[PDB]
């Protein structure tokens, strides 16, 4: 499983690089925004805060289709190995197709529903993207539409995955890894939800305790 | 997964094959008849519309078996890889058997039950053609009977295929590719309805809105 | 059960009147605009229309709570019984607390979610209408929307009821009524899908043709 | 559970009276027409064939609802507390509206669908009658319609009922009664299969044998 | 829940009748058969050793159904408030609705499918008794059909009961019993193995040694 | 999956030959009788109606285990490739056992039970033949013995299939085949019935009224 | 929802009475045995320590139903409330048929299966006790049976209740109510646990500390 | 599947070898004491009865892991190929590991737990032996371990087989095969059972008798 | 499937490694605490009392993930092939990250959620231990959370295996290895339980009655 950042914090990348087995770093332009500084200056950053390895996401700013190729070549001259994000729309479909024919791996983003989703890896993305928050505050239910989304990629494009994103809690991303996704992106409360729990210290300092009961000291 | 349009306009189809990943466009005698143009004036037409490439569905219209083949060798000779379509009657049946005999590919249409398309399949066609809104305005269920039909290809005619047609809604698209339908054949309405979103929109708008916001231009 | 009809179409309900076993009509600002006259003269004509008896839905047009009691005060001068709608927001909300208060019909219209739909039940609602088209066009799931609302309002606010709305194809609201809906508006043309049968048509003249071979009589 | 017998044959009828738990005989224009005798005559031998107890069905035979409502007084003066039948038709919908505001029983008749039997029933048909058959031999499953309409019955218009006829074997009608359906007619063959098991007359042989080994006599 | 002997065995009638909550005793021509000895000498001994109290049951040896009434009225008349059985035939239904008419208890005995106890129940039978070793024996599965039965009883004839019989192992009965059986009756080989557990006796000995160990006696 | 006839009327199965995808053609000792015509005689005459291919069954006369060999060994020699039926018994299964010694293809008929059926195929049977029909007429359920029957053949005896007969509607040969059965044996009224829809000859009717209206001619 | 004591802990059960909602004490010799004391000792202690209330069970020595019987006499006469317990054997269900019809409650202890447990509260028992460890430990599944058991006395016994045991975890105790258990018995090791939570002394500290930094005090 | 008998009868095994497809014949001292005869008679007669092949079972008597393995040896010198029979003891456990280690196939009989076959399988055991009836008799359910056992078996030790045994009915070994058991044992009388069906003796008498009726022979 | 033993007891773990196919030995603080002796001489004890071989498990105790790498270079100092145990903390998973780029085998221990021993798996643990009492004991459920820990390793680390540990009953431990685990450690408490059956013995008593009842002796 391929696991993600949805952030542009260089600093907390850089952080959680060192603990999570981290497959990337995931950005939009919200995120980028939040982040205050250009793509020319944040992806390099954030590839250098991965280790100089690892494999980044960015979105296409351009409405039309070739504006959005154009945009994707932009980012592949920022970064080589850039995986570009694109919402699955007509023009959208259109910039994907384009990008597949030009080689250029492509990302389905903007996916709210499992037959967009569908549609966005047939174009040829590699990845299709859901944010299950979203798509829970719209109404529907986030995490049945990722089930039926890497349903539909499995049995109809075996070559496209799906990176669930828009996670408020931990279960949200364990119900999307229990669905079967193979990839997963994640914010940074979340992610660092994940790891901490206080019942893991407790239990440490209780297996300290008994070393000391029964040896005196901490170490070994 | 092949991706059809049923639909003989040309002109929406050129539109539609540079967004959705199209595997062809398939064509019914009604479909035909509201184009009001002939075979071999609206098949070329279409292929043309399609980039050259793709794979063409086009229906016999005689009654017997032998006259079925007849119209089958003639749309063979309009289009030189079509794939005809043939109701799946005794003399449709017999006509796809000849068929198959005779190496042209051939699509059992106006299939009720999964039964019927079974038969169709076994006789030696490719696909199978049930009609969804048909079948849910016959009184019975068009995704209950589509999907009979695919376990049955699946696990009896392996080399046979569901092209499920048919659609008022896009969930009911997104419900037979669910139950593992390896072609769907979309009319113009339910292909354009499955990429627009408003929702996607208002996003592509908040993400240009904060791009602004954090750098006061739209582009890059 | 009761059934409604969704349209303002005078002529059409009318006729329709007499064959289904019509609860009321329904209608929306949109309905109501393309039957292009006021609710002032539509309403009495549909209300005549329904034999003078039935229960008629109409949508307030204020933004403000304040506003949308004044617009359902105005629309229960209009028609004494006529059971407003209301959308489901914030404002929509405090109108429909309002409106319990007085002791106005309410109805919980533009509802996207279970949940929603159940906040405006137990803001006093008497009905809850969801869109089961707009909300599979918004990506999710209508059905599934629908039976979680009926449920809850089941469970949680017994005395409201769900008037499932939006069906393109008459499975929809088969769909509808399995998962338990007290009611169900329809539009003309799935009004008239629901009734119209080639293969009853077939079966009464088989019937007629053996009452012909055997008696040689059409009568009795 | 209400046992009706789907023939005109008199004889049978009677035959069968005695051992069936019937509740009533069931008509058709073509059984009528296979019986090759008019209602006025038929009718009262079949009500004489079952002692003089039982309900009686008759279908109607106009096309226009005024003539369908005439057809109806004419079979209630042959037969005093016949339940008519009359096809689910608009037509047909309207003659039930008329014949429930008129205080006679009527039936639903030529029901394809779970909707169209609803339909019926909110009209004021008492009961439901889909056949079995003939929707399996419409591509469509039977015993799933003759379900779903059993469930919207009773669950939309408790005071209806589903009389489920047309059975080839009597495990489809094995298959409705556990449906929950409330009526069924079987035809004679159907009938006298669900009576008619060897092993029970084997079973018997066997009791007699093991009587005269131990006892040397048959009876008592 | 009933719960019978299905045996002729007066010593062992006795034995059993202090131990278990019987209801009664059950007997066939075949029990009767090994018993050698007559109803009229038998069933006041099967009476007898149940304390006076209790609900026998006696099957009638006739073939036609007046036959079967008079052995009914021979049967009470040895036992004045004896259950017969008859076999469901087309005159055992007839003989049921006799004794019905009479008011006779009857039971519906030989019942090999759902849909025959489900007649017999109808005819007027109070008890219907599938044999679960003879229809598993027939290739079928008894748990099944009875199962069914009840099912059908419960919602079609809610006066009658099932009494389930031919138990080879205490699994059967448990499973008839968790199928809702109302009633369930047992040879003596598979009432003694209900009873007969080696582990609550050393269960009893761990206890008497406890109390021993930490007392030095065995009772209070 | 192969596709049999279960008739020995050599007209019909040549008129069906051409038609139906038929695997062979199946007989047993009564349809032979229906036929009135000798084995020496009808399997020549069906093998010819067949085309010259296909594979036919017949069943042996004998009742011991060497006289079924015997008969086994006639049939092969009036038809080379003949695939005999031996009735699953104990002097069946012994024949089935040397049949499978000397290599000649057996099939076991008469088969009432999974476990029956899975011994015939364990001994060395190639097909095994559940008749839906009468299974059903006995009591129990022909599907549910086909579906165990098939699933312990493809979990215990790979080699075998089921080739399930005895059919009184489509429906049933729909669900045997649902069940996943490897072959099915068609009579024919019923092989008749699965190619025969009114709704199919009433799409192409108006398929060919639009291409008149369209064009004004009804070839091509 | 009646919360029993498995222990003869005196000092415990005081203790663990003000805290739980205990519903009486319930003892088996080999806890009376651990206890060290006799019953006329125990009893009234354990009586005292519930404070008066609640509602006691002791188990009988006897081997033989009358010996069980004057055990039973025995126990009521030291508490004249006491709930006897009786092991489900054939001497047991005498002695519990003999209770019931001397009006001492009773209890089926020494249970297994369910079968078992169904006869002891058919014989009149008001409780009947799986011991879930000891059936777990047996090989069986204790929670399946308790369940078995549990739906068995609702749907044939409904004035018996369920009296689970023999919990090594907190979570059989938790599956055995969610059964539907009517009743628990838990020991105090298990009793203990359901209550200690260090997750809820983490949070109290917490909001101790929260209530400190923005008051500066504990109390109010 | 491998086929066994249950059975020390030379006389019987022959019989049956001939009809069955035997796999072996599976001895327990039970048996054998049964049969009155030592091993070193028995097993030579029961190998020849099987036509000098298939594949021998027999058990240990010995207490001590080391006397286990030394009647092991001796079992393999009274017959070369004999499959052991050890129950699933800690010394049991501790033969089947030494056995293992010695290479001589070793079968886990007295097999009460899915986990106990486990660890029988585990420590080297070819098959595991769990007895339906004495695990239905131990107050569980033996069709349930025996399912728990071979899902463990398949999914944890792919090498080891589940041997069901202890059969009353026919039904249960019908259970234990579609569970997935790779091998049975049965009776004599379950195996009888499974092979003599009357329905099948009245469905070639039929036969016969339309052979006759139609020819006027019964031969061919 | 791998047999692990929770305990640093060297006497009973040489006692069980005869009896068990135990795959090694599994410590933790607590448990050597408990063992009173340190690392450097328990592990050579207990990896020679499983006769050489096996593959024993050690924790570290550092809290900073270089700490906890300089303890993993310790133990395998002292142990050559030791797989490590790791705490999966923030620290924990760097730890365990650097382990896997150092190639030494590491263990997720104190693992609470699917999500957390995901997250370790995918750091590089081979295995991951998850406490199903310790689990329970926090008001969740310890086999639901193994069984979502396992299908998350199979489906996104098929290289790691989860090693459920805290077992209080046997019926844990066969739940666990039911849901699919790889590997399972149980107490000593736990482990004689799986093994140690009174009906076991009682058989085998039975068993050798026979035979001294049929022989007189009890040999052989």
Redesign the interface.
Known sequence: ?E?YLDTSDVVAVKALS????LAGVTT???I???G?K??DVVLPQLHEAMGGQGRLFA?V???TAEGMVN?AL?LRSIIADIVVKV?????G??AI?MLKAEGIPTCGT?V?????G??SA???AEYVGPYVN??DA????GI??VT?LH??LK???PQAKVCAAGFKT?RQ??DC??A?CESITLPLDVAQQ???????????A???Q??Q???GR???
């Open positions: 499983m696991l060192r603990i999570f087995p939009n332009p919200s980028i925004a939040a205050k250009p793509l979105q700013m351009a409405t945009d932009k919402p699955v729309t007509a023009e479909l259109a197709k903007a709210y529903g499992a037959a967009q569908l549609l047939l174009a040829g979203v798509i719209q109404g529907g239910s049945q539409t039926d349903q539909l049995m109809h494009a931990p991303a364990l890894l229990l079967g994940m790891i901490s729990y206080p019942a893991v210290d407790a239990a440490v209780k297996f300290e008994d070393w009961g029964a040896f901490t170490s070994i």
